[PDB]
Design a binder for this molecule. Structure first.
Ligand SMILES: [Mg+2]
Ligand SMILES: [Zn+2]
Ligand SMILES: [Zn+2]
Ligand SMILES: [Zn+2]
Ligand SMILES: [Zn+2]
Lengths: 49, 484, 49, 67, 257, 82, 135, 44, 420, 44, 114
RNA sequence: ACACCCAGCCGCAA
């Protein structure tokens, strides 16, 4: 964080890389957002059967 | 230890001329595994003839097929005598030739069969060189003086084998020609007639060389045999491709632009349709739209709106087609029947048309509106999915989103329905795995339960049946007595 | 019982339809210069098989 | 990564015009005038120069693993 | 029955492009002449590269490919040097190839450009086109590049790097007279450079007795071979091909008889 | 059964065509006698075709009726479909 | 049997095309009179219909079964080969008629169901094929 | 068998089956030099 | 109450690079948006420092002539994923029929779409036993239980293949032998059909403190006639055949197309935006700036592009007269030429190719194994046996499912049916 | 996603391997959603 | 893997001949030349030159397959003029044409150079 | 005379 282009290049890290991923055992893992029903909101549904 | 005595077996490599079988999953119908003769070409990719692209429900864009090699003389013999694609041109599923001239050949066949086409001497020699069954005698040119010109129909007549007798109607056949005079002249050069294995008149298209009953290839198979049909297919493809090298085909923006008068007429039609739907929705708001019998007020309002919009899109498509130029490649591609349809021409030129999801128009996802940009409680065409603009003209964002919804519906149903059809066809084939015909010509189950006394109530296989007309049921009593 | 069950199982995954030798797979591209019966096969599959 | 030596379509020499192209651009000239001055009449070479992006400047920023 | 009498006129002879007009000739002859211009004109180019040491950011195959595409001036010794395959020479000798050595090391903060000028030849006749300069690779401080390369004799059929012409332009019948191409809307099309119609007229009238003739060429060299000796070499190569066919056909027909 | 009462289609069909051609080709491929004169043919399949056209197959087809009784047919009484 | 006036029906041999082939193979001139006794046609078609057998036998039950199986082809054949129709529309000659009868016999015999066909699998796969196009 | 390390680039001679470092920077990343053995590269 | 920033912003990352997405049909926008993930290029600048399995990189990427305003903000310009190439949408000899492509062998020889295939392998010093410890060392022919005919002398004394040495298929790269409970060669081998060259070799200490090595093997991949290609409008295609420069057609100005797709690809799958891109690319290349092709723009339409092209000396609809490459005769029609963006895809025929002939055999089923990497066979699925039943080829089906797969003999008693 | 021993009730598919075929691929993978569904209504 | 060597496109390895003659049996006085390791560059020339001969009926060429470097040329003459001699005469006229073209190009270049 | 054990999970091609 906070490093400019020069330090990132000197540090063997791509300036253009957006980041946003973890590194576990050398494999770059990225979390994916998961949808779920909104909490604390009364709904109404009509089950057909 | 390399000395070979009689009785040894040597595992040679796959030499040319050997027999193999292909397969493309999903293997939907029995056509998807035919036998082929092997040929050795450079590079690292299979290479098969184009017309086979239809039997295997395949397109040559990343598709990959299997290749099984038989490993016994008995196996090779049966595959040669049963599954070799020359002997299995016509499928018994619908007693029509699943094989068909397709893509550049078919369009080039159309442009090569027109009356206007003519060939100089050297071009005719070049075309004849690509044939294989040619007897070696250059036919008399249709034109002698001032200079020799051959007609494409004459070269095609050379291509036809034996003495075939076929009569088919071109796609753009005017219905008035049959009743009126010039019935056998056909000023539009419709009414394809093949006499004594020579092409006499008419342009060829999907309805004559395509995968249709009573097609020219169908009659070729039924009459001459199966090898001659293979030569027919190969000759057509080779010679037409090598003539297309001279003629050439293309498609571009010039084929999508229409005349300014056409644009003005199209805009006028769209404006009138929008005004009419404004009128009918005004009537609905003021409560004078009398409900259709058996239908709800909303139901009949939707039906009337859909009727108006469909009339508008049909009129726009007809106007675009009328203004569509003869040299326009879109018209050639559609009328030939290679790919595309007149509806696609209408969408490209005039109007994309109404976009609908699950049959109905765009649903009201928000509070009684389709998107935030439209006023609440609107049933106008622009605000419910209708796409006034065309692809060439470009789509505005809202209609672009609605078209995206329509395309997503296409993707979703085409992608989910394979699981159901895969289960139905597996259940059917598993049920009917054992039913077959014994040598009493009685169809029987696995445990010898007579299912049918004779196959198809007549004992006739499906590969040798044709469409015919009784010519005795329809005529009246007076006409019957007169004619018999 | 789960070994003998449906897809990815004994009866349907190893007996009714089974993996077999003497086979090949690769992409397909057009070639209008071969007859209908013919087909191109490259030298690698021809040699190995 | 770096300006290709030969135009893909025809084959006119192109690798020797990248530096001149940048020099002409620096001297207040527009792209069209610069390409005309460099003699690339055919448009395949024009897009060969114009559409190329040189990553090699970004690549040299990394120190070599030898010395 | 006998051959026709071609005639040639030259309209421009700059240092790198040549325009000439060939009249009274079959279309096939002209088409084959252009094909030989772009396929079967001998030229010297790099084909065998040995990378002694490459610390550049670019990899060995990249540098080898780029060196291969570099043109080499071979106005003279294309005829003298024999093909490596034909030379009884094992591997490579100076009689059938030209040897190249490249040695550049960057030892300063400023970026070093490994231009084609850095290439050093043995025979002074064969050198890159420098008598701007073609760039090969850019090097940071401490990035060496040492390699040796041999240049063979080849023509365009083997590989594009042996293609001498930049791009050959071949146009015949500028104002469409034989209707070899049909314009649906002729007025919309620009008139060709070699046209001879007025502004009002769109196309020449139909010529049923016409035949293609008066072909226009615009052969442009890549700087390796002069753009006029290239045509002579092309014609000589076609003549030699036909003479080889003569010898082979004579041998075959005598053997049959 | 005897010579009489022989009821079955006398058209030697495509399935038995394939079987007979394959088996005869295999037999000749194992150095078996040839039934007809041959003029410079070596492929077993082609010679099998030619000798079938000569109608001299040394094989009798046994046909299984659904009931269980067999019915033997020689090739030379059968007429070729082609 | 056929309500709704559906005259389109599937039969083995394309009789019209066969007659046309006979015409243009024997160069028969429709203008000139032909030499074809109508009784020759009558017993010709009758003998042909006798030689087309689906249910081979001689007992009354087998004969009735054969008649029922071949009724549609026989009726279409008689309709197309009627005496007046041959006299007027087609105008074939005697050798033309003999060749037509022989070719019809050969084609029908070729089109007969071959024992051993796996009719069940063929039917299941053929009827399952359009299911992928029903979308 | 000379190894080149991460950043300070010393061709340290190890040949001793010890934990891999260099006496200059100590970074625990090592690379090995391009082989002296030649290899042809076709320019095709 | 509110006003949109810009309507085009609805598009996603991979869908934003599509030029004129509105003019295309939405299904093909979807398909292209799927491909943009697979469109190779300079994926990250520091690729040579990194090393990971299945990493590609392209030689000569180019920012597209027909750009989109959003693309500059996705940083696509810095890291393109394709080349602008002259395209001729026309029928030809027939090797582009259906969805296929004809390419330029001469241009391919000049570096057109030539790309690298970096592949990285790793091996570990996972000591399990107390004397059964593996070590990196050059195996000897007699001291190792595992002895193949593979070429072993290429390795150094450490047992790691030196960088910069050509390695063929099925070669040893890491010589590691496990001591027996004298030794056993548990060494990894380079898999089938790569013929690459090892470039970089690494040695390190793993997390648990044992020696750990990685090596990277690269191999240039000149496009053969099997490689999947697609435009920015969902134009799935493969290289049917490569023609040299003298075989393909050529304009009166000497321009020769790099790629020739078939007109059949346009009408059925309406992608008029492809033609719009071609025209805009032509006018942009002629003029000198990068063509603005943001999705929803009333300023830019086909008519103004046509007028600019006409002003610059071409057919106002983008067509051009092309001469037959073989004959030299003018083509009767007039082909549609112009540049456009094309992307090489991850799918390569050299990777998808596969064959099997009595190779290795599964332990449990005693049948051919899974995958080409394991040299396994192909499945003869249930729908295939059904097809062969429909054919009626009995003994073909028999050998396919019994003899070619796994023949086996058993002894069974006659009184009882139990295995004996 | 969850405790190791309770993989049955643990939702799967989270933390996919980052795709690195192209910069566009990386950005698309970073900005991605996913539904927990294994009928066409949820998928339209 | 299977990419053929580039030099293969024109070189003749030991085991084949440049020319083979086949007498077509379909029509009298016909030949089937089978020039090997060539392409359209020669086939087009040969077809054009033969077609100019007044006393030859048929003349054409085809490549059986673009990947395979082979061409087949068929020539049919009147029943007093062997196809082989027609081929030879066409080639000789071609050689004279190309030599004349080279000479006149030399003259044009010399005249242009001052 | 070859060497790599399997289950699960995920992406992706037609
Ligand atoms: Mg597909
Ligand atoms: Zn160029
Ligand atoms: Zn030498
Ligand atoms: Zn250090
Ligand atoms: Zn027992």
């Amino acid at each position: 964080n906070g490093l400019t282009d020069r330090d990132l290049c000197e540090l063997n890290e791509c300036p253009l890389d957006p980041g946003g991923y973890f590194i576990i055992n050398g494999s770059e893992k990225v979390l994916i957002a998961q949808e779920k029903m909104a909490t604390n909101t009364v709904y109404v549904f009509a089950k057909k059967d | 230890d390399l000395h070979l005595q009689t009785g040894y077996k040597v595992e040679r490599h796959m030499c040319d001329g050997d027999i193999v079988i292909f397969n493309r999953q999903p293997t939907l119908h029995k056509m998807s595994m035919m036998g082929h003769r092997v040929r050795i070409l450079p590079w690292s990719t299979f290479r098969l003839n184009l017309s086979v692209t239809t039997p295997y429900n395949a397109d040559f864009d990343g598709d990959e097929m299997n290749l099984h090699l038989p490993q016994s003389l008995e196996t090779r013999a049966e595959i040669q005598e049963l599954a070799m694609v020359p002997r299995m041109i016509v499928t018994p599923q619908s007693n029509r030739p699943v094989m068909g001239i397709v893509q550049d050949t078919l369009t080039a066949v159309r442009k090569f069969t027109k009356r206007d086409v003519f060939l100089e001497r050297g071009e005719v020699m070049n075309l004849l060189m690509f044939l294989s069954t040619w007897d070696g005698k250059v036919p008399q040119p249709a034109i002698l003086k001032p200079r020799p010109l051959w007609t494409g129909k004459q070269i095609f007549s050379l291509i036809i084998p034996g003495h075939i007798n076929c009569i088919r109607t071109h796609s753009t056949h005017p219905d008035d020609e049959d009743s009126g005079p010039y019935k056998h002249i056909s000023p539009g050069d419709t009414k394809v007639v093949v006499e004594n294995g020579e092409l006499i008149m008419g342009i060829l298209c999907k309805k004559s060389l395509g995968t249709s009953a009573g097609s020219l290839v169908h009659i070729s198979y039924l009459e001459m045999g199966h090898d001659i049909t293979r030569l027919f297919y190969s000759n057509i493809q080779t010679v037409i491709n090598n003539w297309l090298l001279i003629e050439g085909h293309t498609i571009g923006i010039g084929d999508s632009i229409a005349d300014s008068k056409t644009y003005q007429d199209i805009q006028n039609t769209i404006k009138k349709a929008k005004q009419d739907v404004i009128e009918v929705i005004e009537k609905a708001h003021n409560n004078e739209l009398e409900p259709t019998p058996g239908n709800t007020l909303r139901q009949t309002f939707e039906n009337q709106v859909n009727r108006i919009l469909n009339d508008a899109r049909d009129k726009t498509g007809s106007s675009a087609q009328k203004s569509l130029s003869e040299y326009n490649n879109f018209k050639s591609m559609v009328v030939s029947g290679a790919k595309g349809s007149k509806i696609n021409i209408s969408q490209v030129i005039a109007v994309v048309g109404q976009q609908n999801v699950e049959g109905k128009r765009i649903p009201f996802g928000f509070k009684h509106r389709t998107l935030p940009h439209f006023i609440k409680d609107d049933y106008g065409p622009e605000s419910r999915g209708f796409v006034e603009n065309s692809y060439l003209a470009g789509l505005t964002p809202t209609e672009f989103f609605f078209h995206a919804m329509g395309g997503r519906e296409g993707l979703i149903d085409t992608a989910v329905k394979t699981a159901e059809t895969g289960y139905i066809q597996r259940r059917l084939i598993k049920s009917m795995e054992s039913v077959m015909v014994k040598y009493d010509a009685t169809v029987r189950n696995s445990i010898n339960q007579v299912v049918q006394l004779r196959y198809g109530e007549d004992g006739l296989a499906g590969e040798s049946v044709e469409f015919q007309n009784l010519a005795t049921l329809k005529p009246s009593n007076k006409a019957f007595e007169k004619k018999f | 019982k789960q070994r003998l069950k449906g897809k990815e199982g004994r009866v349907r995954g190893n007996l009714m339809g089974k993996r077999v030798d003497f086979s090949a797979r690769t992409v397909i591209t057009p070639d209008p210069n071969l007859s209908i019966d013919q087909v191109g096969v490259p030298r690698s599959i021809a040699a190995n098989m | 990564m770096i300006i290709p030596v030969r135009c893909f379509t025809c084959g006119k020499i192109v690798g020797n015009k990248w530096e001149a192209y940048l020099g002409l651009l620096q001297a207040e000239y527009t792209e069209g005038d610069a390409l005309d001055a460099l003699g690339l009449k055919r448009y395949c070479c024009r897009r060969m120069l114009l559409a190329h992006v040189d990553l090699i400047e970004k690549l040299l920023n990394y120190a070599p693993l030898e010395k | 029955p006998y051959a026709n009498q071609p005639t040639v006129r030259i309209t421009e002879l700059t240092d790198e492009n040549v325009k000439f007009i060939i009249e009274n000739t079959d279309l096939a002859v002209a088409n084959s002449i252009r094909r030989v211009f772009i396929a079967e004109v001998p030229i010297i180019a790099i084909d065998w590269v040995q990378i002694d040491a490459n610390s550049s950011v670019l990899h060995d195959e990249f540098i080898a490919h780029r060196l291969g595409l570099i043109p080499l001036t071979s106005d003279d010794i294309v005829d003298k040097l024999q093909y490596s395959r034909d030379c009884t020479c094992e591997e490579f000798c100076p009689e059938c190839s030209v040897e190249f050595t490249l040695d550049v090391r960057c030892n300063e903060d400023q970026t070093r450009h490994v231009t084609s000028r850095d290439l050093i030849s043995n025979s002074p006749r064969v050198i890159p086109v420098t008598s701007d300069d073609i760039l090969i690779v850019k090097l940071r401080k401490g990035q060496e590049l040492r390699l040796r390369a041999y240049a063979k004799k080849g023509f365009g059929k083997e590989h594009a790097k042996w293609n001498p012409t930049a791009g050959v332009a071949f146009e015949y019948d500028p104002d469409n007279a034989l209707r070899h191409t049909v314009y649906p809307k002729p007025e919309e099309w620009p008139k060709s450079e070699y046209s001879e119609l007025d502004e009002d007229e769109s196309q020449a009238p139909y010529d049923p007795n016409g035949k293609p003739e008066r072909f226009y060429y615009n052969v442009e060299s890549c700087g390796s071979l002069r753009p006029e000796t290239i045509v002579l070499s092309a014609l000589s190569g076609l003549k030699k091909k036909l003479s080889d066919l003569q010898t082979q056909l004579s041998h075959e027909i005598q053997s049959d008889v | 059964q005897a010579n009489q009462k022989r009821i079955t289609t006398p058209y030697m069909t495509k399935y038995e065509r394939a079987r007979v051609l394959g088996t005869r080709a295999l037999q000749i491929a194992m150095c078996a006698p040839v039934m007809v004169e041959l003029e410079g043919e070596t492929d077993p399949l082609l010679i099998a075709m030619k000798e079938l056209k000569a109608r001299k197959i040394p094989i009798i087809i046994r046909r299984y009726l659904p009931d269980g009784s067999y019915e033997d047919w020689g090739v030379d009484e059968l007429i070729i479909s082609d | 049997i056929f309500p709704t006036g559906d005259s389109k029906v599937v039969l083995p041999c394309n009789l019209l095309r066969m007659i046309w082939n006979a015409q243009k193979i024997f160069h028969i001139n429709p203008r000139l009179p032909s030499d074809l006794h109508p009784i020759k046609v009558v017993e010709g078609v009758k003998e042909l219909s006798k030689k087309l057998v689906i249910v081979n036998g001689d007992d009354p039950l087998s004969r009735q079964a054969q008649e029922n199986a071949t009724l549609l082809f026989n009726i279409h054949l008689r309709s197309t080969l009627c005496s007046r129709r041959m006299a007027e529309e087609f105008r074939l000659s005697g050798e033309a008629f003999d060749w037509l009868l022989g070719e019809i016999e050969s084609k029908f015999n070729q089109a007969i169901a071959h024992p051993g066909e796996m009719v069940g699998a063929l039917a299941a796969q053929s009827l399952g094929e359009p299911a992928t196009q029903m979308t | 068998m000379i190894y080149i390390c991460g950043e300070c680039h010393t061709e340290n001679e190890i040949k001793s089956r010890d934990p891999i470092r260099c006496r200059e920077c100590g970074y625990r990343i090592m690379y090995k030099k391009r082989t002296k053995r030649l290899v042809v590269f076709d320019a095709r | 109450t509110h006003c949109e920033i810009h309507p085009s912003m609805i598009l996603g990352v991979c869908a934003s690079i599509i030029p004129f997405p509105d003019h295309n049909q939405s299904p093909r926008n979807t398909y292209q948006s799927a491909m943009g993930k697979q469109a190779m290029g300079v994926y990250i600048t520091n690729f040579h420092v990194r090393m990971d399995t299945l990493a590609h990189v392209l030689y000569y990427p180019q920012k597209p002539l027909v750009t989109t305003r959003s693309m500059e903000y996705l940083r696509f310009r810095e890291l393109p994923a394709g080349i602008n190439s002259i395209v001729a949408i026309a029928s030809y000899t027939g090797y582009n029929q259906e969805d296929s492509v004809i390419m330029n062998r001469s241009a391919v020889d000049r570096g057109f779409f030539r790309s690298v295939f970096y592949r990285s392998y790793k091996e570990q010093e996972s000591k399990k036993g107390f004397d059964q410890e593996e070590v990196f060392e050059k195996p000897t022919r007699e001291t190792c239980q595992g002895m193949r005919h593979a070429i072993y002398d290429k390795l150094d004394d450490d047992g790691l293949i030196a960088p910069g040495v050509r390695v063929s298929g099925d070669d040893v790269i890491i010589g590691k032998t496990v001591t027996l409970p004298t030794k056993r060669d548990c060494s990894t081998f380079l898999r089938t059909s790569e013929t690459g060259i090892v470039d970089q070799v690494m040695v390190t200490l793993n997390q648990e403190g044992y020696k750990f090595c990685k090596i990277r093997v690269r191999s240039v991949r000149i496009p053969q006639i099997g490689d999947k290609f697609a435009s920015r409008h969902g134009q799935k295609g493969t290289c049917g055949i490569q023609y040299r420069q003298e075989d393909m057609p050529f304009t009166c100005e000497g321009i020769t197309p790099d790629i020739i797709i078939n007109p059949h690809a346009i009408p059925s799958r309406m992608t008029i935006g492809h033609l719009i891109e071609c025209l805009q690319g032509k006018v942009s290349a002629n003029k000198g700036e990068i063509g603005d092709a943001t999705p929803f723009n009333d300023a830019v339409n086909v008519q103004k592009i046509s007028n600019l092209l006409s002003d610059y000396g071409y057919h106002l609809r983008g067509n051009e007269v092309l001469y037959n490459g073989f004959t030299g005769r003018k083509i009767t029609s007039q082909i549609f030429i112009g540049p456009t963006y094309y992307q090489r895809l991850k799918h390569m025929v050299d990777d998808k190719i596969h064959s099997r002939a009595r190779g290795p055999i599964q332990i449990l089923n005693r049948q051919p194994m899974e995958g080409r990497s394991r040299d396994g066979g192909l499945r003869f699925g249930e729908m295939e046996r059904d097809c062969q039943i429909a054919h009626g080829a009995a003994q073909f089906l028999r050998e396919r499912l019994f003899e070619a797969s796994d023949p086996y003999q058993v002894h069974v008693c006659n009184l009882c049916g139990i295995m004996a | 996603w969850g405790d190791q021993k309770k993989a049955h009730q643990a939702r799967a598919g989270v933390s996919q391997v980052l795709n690195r075929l192209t910069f566009a691929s990386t950005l698309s993978h970073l900005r991605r959603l996913n539904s927990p569904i294994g009928l066409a209504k949820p998928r339209q | 893997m299977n990419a053929p060597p580039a030099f293969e496109s024109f070189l003749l390895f030991e085991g084949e001949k440049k020319i083979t003659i086949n007498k077509d049996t379909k029509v009298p006085n016909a030949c089937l030349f089978t020039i090997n390791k060539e392409d359209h560059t020669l086939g087009n020339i040969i077809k054009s030159q033969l077609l100019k001969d007044p006393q030859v009926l048929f003349a054409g060429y085809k490549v059986p397959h673009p990947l395979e470097h082979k061409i087949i040329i068929r020539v049919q003459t009147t029943p007093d003029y062997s196809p082989q001699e027609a081929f030879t005469n066409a080639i000789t006229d071609l050689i004279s044409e190309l030599s004349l073209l080279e000479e006149r190009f030399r003259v044009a270049i010399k005249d242009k150079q001052e």
